[PDB]
Design a protein around this nucleic acid. Structure first.
Length: 631
DNA sequence: GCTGATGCGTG
DNA sequence: GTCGGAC
DNA sequence: GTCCGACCACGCATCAGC
C-alpha cells in the first residue's frame, strides 16, 4: 500500500521498504508521501536522505522513471533551453479546482487567499492510481497546449488529475501547477540526493540488486567524505551541462565516476554562469580579497548573454538561466564574424547585452532593452540597438577554459577578439588596490550609466568553477554604500503567502503630492523586514484597519490592498533606481505626461516614528530624484 | 479584430 | 533582483 | 556561508470575452 510509504525510516531498505513492485511504474503517491516527509522536517541533511531513499528505490526498481521523479521534485518540465512552460496560473488552477468540487469560484478564491496555499483547498468511480511518469506527461501535455480554447483544454487535464488524486496527491499537484511547491528543497539538494542515491545503490544492477548501501563497510568519517567527494563530481558536471535529459542517461549506464568523461562542456549547450555576492564597500572588498590580486570592472545594466558558436558556424545565444535567446538577437548572429579573429573556430563568450543609441552613441537604460521583441526574426525591424560587452571567455578552439584563472581567460579574450566600437567592446577595467583609484572607478561607473563595479580575482580562486564557490565574484553597487533613501507613507497591506500565511506579506507605500493634497501610490514593499519587525508591523498597523480607502489616497491601477490602512505610518525605503512606472500614479505628469514613478528593488530599513504622513518624501522630491539620475 | 487580464522571465 | 531564516 | 523561499517592478506574449 503506497499510502503507508515512509522513505524517512531508519535503515531504509531500497527494495523491501518500497511501495511498488520491480518493473512497475512508480506511483505518484510514493512521490507525494516523500514530499510530505521532506516538508515535515527543516534540516536539509534530513531532506536529502529522505529524497535519496526514494531515488534509491527508483533506480533499483524502475530505472526509466528516474528522470520524471527528478523533474517532479525540481518542479520543472525539462531542460531550460527547451522553454516549456505550463501557462497555468492561479485563476486557471482555481477554476479547475472549482469544477472538481462544484463550488463557486469566489469560495475557492477566498480559501486560497486566507490560507496562502491553493493546494489545501484542492485536497479538502475511483480511477486507476496516478503514476509518476503519467503525471509528468500530463504536465508536459498542458504546457504544449496553445491557441484558442487551449485554457479550457488545460482545465480538463487538471480536472482529470484531481479526480484520480488520493490523500496528499491533490495538494502537491496543485502546488506543482501553481509553481509554488514550498518543499524547502531545490536544485542543490536534489543533486545531493541524486549523487547519494546512485552511490549507495549503484545503477544497472540485475534485480535483486546485489548492493544497496555502500556506507555499510566504512566509518562515518569515510562515508561522509565519500558522499561529498562523489557529490562534487555531479555538481561540477551539472554546472557545465545543466541538463538532466543528458546527464541521467549517461549516469544510469556509465556510472557517476566516469560521468565527467562524457558529459563535458561543448559549444551549443548552456552552462551555469558565474554569479556575484554583495559587498558593503571597498573595505569589505580588500578584506575578503586580502592578499589577492583583483580587477575592477563596470557592472553594466542590461541582459547577460552567453554566446556559443559551434564548429561549423552555428551561433546560439542563451540567457543567465539557460534560456534560448537566438531569435531574440538576430543582430548579434550577423555580428559574429566581425568580432572573432580567423584563428577562432569555436568559442563561448560571457557578455552583457545593453541598449545602445546608434545616433547619440551612448548607452540606454535597462527599461529600453526590455522593449525588445523576443521572437523578432525580422532583423531589419529591430528598433532598439544592442552593444555587446564581453567580460569572460569559457571556451576557445575546442578547449575548455574553466580550470584556467581569470587572468588567463582575460589574455585569451583580449587577443583573439576585436573591438568593433559601438557594437562590441571589452568591459571597462582597472587593475589596482588603491582605495582612491577604486573609488574614482565606481563613481565614473555611475557617471557612465552603470550600476557599480565588479570585483573578480585574477589568479587565486579565479577559476570559472561554480561547484567550488558560486559567488566568488563581488558586487559593489552604489545603493549598497550611507550613499538615496525615501521616506514614504503606508496606505494598505496585502495578505501573505507560503512562509507568510497568517501575516502581512506585502505593503503599499505612498508619497505626498503637495500641490494636490493627496497620497500617491509609489510601489509595493515585501522585503527588508525581519519576522520580528513583521510582527510589530502587523501589530502596530492592526488598529489602523479601514473598511474603505480614504478620499485623499490615489493608487490608480495598483493592486487594491486587501486591508486598507489608515495613513499614519512613515517608513524609510531604499531602492536601486527610480523607474518610469506605467502603473503607479506617483509624480505623474511631473516627468512623463501619463506615467508615474516607481522604485526599483525596494526594501525596508526602519520605521520613521519621528515623521508623520505630512512629513514624507514629496512627489516633487521623487520627481527630482528621478531627474537627478543619469538617464 | 480588440482589449483587459495574466503568465512568464528577467533581473 | 533584495532580503531574512534555519541549519 | 549555504540553501531556500518569501517579496519587488516591468516588459512581451498570449488568450477569453467581447
Amino acid at each position: 500500500d503506497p499510502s503507508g510509504y515512509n522513505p524517512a525510516k531508519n535503515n531504509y531498505h531500497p527494495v523491501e521498504d518500497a511501495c511498488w513492485k520491480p518493473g512497475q511504474k512508480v506511483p505518484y503517491l510514493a512521490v507525494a508521501r516523500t514530499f510530505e516527509k521532506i516538508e515535515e522536517v527543516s534540516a536539509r541533511l534530513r531532506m536529502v536522505e529522505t529524497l535519496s531513499n526514494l531515488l534509491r528505490s527508483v533506480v533499483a526498481l524502475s530505472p526509466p522513471d528516474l528522470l520524471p521523479v527528478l523533474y517532479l521534485s525540481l518542479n520543472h518540465l525539462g531542460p531550460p533551453q527547451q522553454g516549456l512552460a505550463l501557462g497555468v496560473g492561479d485563476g486557471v488552477l482555481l477554476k479547475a479546482v472549482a469544477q472538481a468540487t462544484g463550488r463557486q469560484l469566489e469560495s475557492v478564491r477566498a480559501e486560497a487567499a486566507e490560507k496562502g496555499d491553493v493546494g489545501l483547498v484542492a485536497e479538502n468511480l475511483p480511477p486507476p492510481p496516478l503514476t509518476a511518469s503519467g503525471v509528468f506527461s500530463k504536465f508536459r501535455d498542458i504546457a504544449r497546449l496553445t491557441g484558442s480554447a487551449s485554457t479550457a483544454k488545460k482545465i480538463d487535464i487538471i480536472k482529470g488529475l484531481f479526480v484520480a488524486c488520493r490523500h496528499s496527491e491533490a495538494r502537491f499537484i496543485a502546488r506543482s501547477l501553481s509553481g509554488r511547491l514550498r518543499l524547502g528543497l531545490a536544485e542543490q539538494s536534489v543533486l545531493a540526493a541524486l549523487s547519494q542515491a546512485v552511490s549507495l545503490t549503484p545503477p544497472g544492477q540485475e534485480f535483486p540488486p546485489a548492493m544497496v548501501d555502500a556506507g555499510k563497510g566504512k566509518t562515518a568519517e569515510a562515508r561522509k567524505t565519500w558522499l561529498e567527494e562523489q557529490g562534487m563530481i555531479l555538481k561540477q558536471t551539472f554546472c557545465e551541462v545543466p541538463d538532466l535529459d543528458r546527464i541521467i542517461p549517461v549516469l544510469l549506464e556509465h556510472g557517476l565516476e566516469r560521468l565527467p568523461e562524457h558529459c563535458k562542456l561543448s559549444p551549443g549547450i548552456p552552462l551555469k554562469p558565474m554569479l556575484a555576492h554583495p559587498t558593503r564597500g571597498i573595505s569589505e572588498v580588500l578584506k575578503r580579497f586580502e592578499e589577492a590580486a583583483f580587477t575592477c570592472e563596470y557592472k553594466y545594466d542590461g541582459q547577460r548573454a552567453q554566446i556559443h558558436a559551434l564548429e561549423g558556424g552555428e551561433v546560439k545565444i542563451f540567457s543567465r538561466n539557460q534560456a534560448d535567446n537566438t531569435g531574440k538577437y538576430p543582430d548579434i548572429i550577423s555580428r559574429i564574424p566581425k568580432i572573432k579573429l580567423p584563428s577562432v573556430t569555436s568559442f563561448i563568450l560571457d557578455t552583457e547585452a545593453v541598449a545602445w543609441d546608434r545616433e547619440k552613441k551612448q548607452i540606454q537604460p535597462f527599461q529600453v532593452l526590455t522593449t525588445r521583441k523576443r521572437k523578432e526574426v525580422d532583423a531589419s525591424e529591430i528598433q532598439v540597438q544592442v552593444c555587446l560587452y564581453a567580460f569572460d571567455l569559457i571556451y576557445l578552439n575546442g578547449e575548455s577554459l574553466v580550470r584556467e584563472p581569470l587572468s588567463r581567460r582575460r589574455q585569451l579574450l583580449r587577443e583573439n577578439f576585436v573591438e568593433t566600437e559601438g557594437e562590441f567592446v571589452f568591459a571597462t577595467s582597472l587593475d589596482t588596490k588603491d582605495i582612491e583609484q577604486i573609488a574614482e572607478f565606481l563613481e565614473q561607473s555611475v557617471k557612465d550609466s552603470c550600476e557599480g563595479l565588479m570585483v573578480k580575482t585574477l589568479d587565486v580562486d579565479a577559476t570559472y568553477e561554480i561547484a567550488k564557490r558560486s559567488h566568488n565574484w563581488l558586487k559593489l553597487k552604489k545603493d549598497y554604500l550611507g550613499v538615496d533613501t525615501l521616506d514614504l507613507v503606508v496606505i494598505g497591506a496585502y495578505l501573505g503567502r507560503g512562509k507568510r500565511a497568517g501575516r502581512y506579506g506585502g505593503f503599499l507605500l505612498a508619497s505626498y503630492d503637495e500641490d494636490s493634497e493627496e497620497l500617491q501610490a509609489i510601489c509595493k514593499l515585501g522585503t527588508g523586514f525581519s519576522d520580528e519587525e513583521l510582527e510589530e508591523h502587523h501589530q502596530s498597523l492592526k488598529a489602523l484597519v479601514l473598511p474603505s480607502p480614504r478620499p485623499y489616497v490615489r493608487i490608480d491601477g495598483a493592486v487594491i490592498p486587501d486591508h486598507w490602512l489608515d495613513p499614519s505610518a512613515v517608513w524609510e525605503v531604499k531602492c536601486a533606481d527610480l523607474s518610469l512606472s506605467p502603473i503607479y500614479p506617483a509624480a505623474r505628469g511631473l516627468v512623463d505626461s501619463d506615467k508615474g514613478i516607481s522604485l526599483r528593488f525596494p526594501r525596508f530599513i526602519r520605521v520613521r516614528e519621528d515623521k508623520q504622513p505630512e512629513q514624507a518624501t514629496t512627489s516633487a522630491q521623487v520627481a527630482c530624484l528621478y531627474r537627478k539620475q543619469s538617464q
